[PDB]
Design a protein around this nucleic acid. Sequence first.
DNA 1: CGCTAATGGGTT
DNA 2: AACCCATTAGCG
Length: 67
Amino acid sequence: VRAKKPRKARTAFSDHQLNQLERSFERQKYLSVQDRMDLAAALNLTDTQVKTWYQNRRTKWKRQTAV
DNA sequence: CGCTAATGGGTT
DNA sequence: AACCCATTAGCG
């Protein structure tokens, strides 16, 4: 049942990282490439981890908007 | 299970 | 390139 393609380990975000990602999201639902890279740098996260966090946060946000 | 990080497969 | 968003899957 295991994938043939290697998947990345699941990142566990710190409370500090989640607090800052949530503050960023409340302010701006979409980030410029520069604002995203800068946030990744400030939090010692990868660009992709921040990009994906934003994407999955927008999914969650759209589901709450629908109720 | 529930939440949500990462990925698939297609769109913008 | 980044997004959309259904899906796959890790873990408390």
